[PDB]
Design a protein around this ligand. Structure first.
Ligand SMILES: OC[C@H]1O[C@@H](O)[C@H](O)[C@@H](O)[C@H]1O
Length: 123
């Protein structure tokens, strides 16, 4: 069981986005038998937002995972799942360094593995 979560390399400049803009990339893997994964936002990120130091909250979205009220999830039994979190076109993105904190969970439902994730994306 390993997890990789990091900010993307594309530069974001403040203002009103025209397009879906990549912000973080996630990799969740385990050779063990499993049903799927949760990605649960934690702390300030509750609600599924990245949050800057001045308290600006920006929505995260992904096309690789589903969403259930307050968390991403997917049924995927393969050894490895990748996801990109992006900012939707049309959102205004203001000042600073935006942190997302979360907890990744592997389930079979019973959770059999869990790990904190954290990364900071610059605007
Ligand atoms: O099948 C199990 C899955 O069911 C979904 O409805 C739920 O949002 C996921 O977190 C996971 O528990």
């Amino acid at each position: 069981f390993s997890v990789e979560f990091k900010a993307t390399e594309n530069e974001i400049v403040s203002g009103k986005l025209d397009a879906d803009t990549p912000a973080f990339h996630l990799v969740m893997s385990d050779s063990g038998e499993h049903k799927g994964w949760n990605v649960r936002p934690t702390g300030a990120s509750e609600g599924g937002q990245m949050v800057s130091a001045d308290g600006t909250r920006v929505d995260l979205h992904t096309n690789e995972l589903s969403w259930d009220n307050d968390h991403w999830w997917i049924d995927d039994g393969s050894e490895r799942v990748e996801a990109t979190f992006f900012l939707a076109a049309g959102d205004e993105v203001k000042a600073g360094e935006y942190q997302f904190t979360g907890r990744v969970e592997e389930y079979v439902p019973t959770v059999i593995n869990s790990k904190d994730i954290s990364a900071t994306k610059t605007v």
